[PDB]
Enzyme design. Structure first.
Site, mmCIF file in Angstrom:
data_model
loop_
_atom_site.group_PDB
_atom_site.id
_atom_site.type_symbol
_atom_site.label_atom_id
_atom_site.label_comp_id
_atom_site.label_asym_id
_atom_site.label_seq_id
_atom_site.Cartn_x
_atom_site.Cartn_y
_atom_site.Cartn_z
ATOM 1 N N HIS A 115 14.432 13.207 -44.225
ATOM 2 C CA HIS A 115 13.253 12.839 -45.279
ATOM 3 C C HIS A 115 13.309 13.822 -46.482
ATOM 4 O O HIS A 115 12.946 13.631 -47.343
ATOM 5 C CB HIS A 115 12.150 12.449 -44.664
ATOM 6 N N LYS A 169 22.024 4.029 -39.770
ATOM 7 C CA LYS A 169 20.424 3.889 -39.922
ATOM 8 C C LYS A 169 20.066 2.898 -41.098
ATOM 9 O O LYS A 169 20.462 3.072 -42.411
ATOM 10 C CB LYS A 169 19.845 4.987 -40.249
ATOM 11 N N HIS A 177 6.933 12.689 -38.687
ATOM 12 C CA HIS A 177 7.328 11.255 -38.818
ATOM 13 C C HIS A 177 7.111 10.984 -40.245
ATOM 14 O O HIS A 177 6.029 11.414 -40.747
ATOM 15 C CB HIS A 177 6.569 10.449 -37.670
ATOM 16 N N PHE A 178 8.028 10.058 -40.849
ATOM 17 C CA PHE A 178 7.655 9.476 -42.103
ATOM 18 C C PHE A 178 7.173 8.010 -41.692
ATOM 19 O O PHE A 178 7.718 7.318 -41.245
ATOM 20 C CB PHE A 178 9.068 9.322 -42.905
ATOM 21 N N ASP A 179 5.828 7.774 -42.229
ATOM 22 C CA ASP A 179 5.293 6.642 -41.738
ATOM 23 C C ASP A 179 5.541 5.355 -42.728
ATOM 24 O O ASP A 179 5.906 4.535 -42.226
ATOM 25 C CB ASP A 179 3.935 6.626 -41.374
#
Ligand code: NH3
Ligand code: NH3
Ligand code: PT
Ligand code: PT
Length: 124
Positions: A12, A41, A119-121
């Site tokens: 990210h 991905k 985490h990238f939400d």
């Protein structure tokens, strides 16, 4: 081996430039960051802000995560992001992506000491 903090930066973080110019950024950076190795991905965001600015979101707006945990944080400010999304025609191992530049708030999950994004939400 890889820490969840280090995984977040690999998937990210692209601090370098504040933009995405090349229609081809996503094809290059999805490859570069090992996100096409075993499979394409499908969706991934890169954040074009300093690591310090992304790490600071962990002390900004506390919100629920999509998974119902409450260790998520919404950036007070909009950030330079790139959205990578696989094209309809993309087939591993020739993974193909459309690049979309945006400025939006990010929502990250924060954990550990130091308390950093893991985490990238979402972006909003
Ligand atoms: N890239
Ligand atoms: N910043
Ligand atoms: Pt790149
Ligand atoms: Pt800053």
């Amino acid at each position: 081996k890889e820490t969840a903090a280090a995984k977040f930066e690999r998937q990210h973080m692209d601090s370098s430039t504040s933009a995405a110019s090349s229609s081809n950024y996503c094809n290059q950076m999805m490859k570069s960051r090992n996100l096409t190795k075993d499979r394409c991905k499908p969706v991934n965001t890169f954040v074009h802000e300093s690591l310090a600015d992304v790490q600071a979101v962990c002390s900004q707006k506390n919100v629920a995560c999509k998974n119902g945990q409450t260790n998520c944080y919404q950036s007070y400010s909009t950030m330079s992001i790139t959205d990578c999304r696989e094209t309809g025609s993309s087939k591993y191992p020739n993974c193909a992506y459309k690049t979309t530049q945006a400025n939006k708030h990010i929502i990250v999950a924060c954990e550990g000491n130091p308390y950093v994004p893991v985490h990238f939400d979402a972006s909003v």
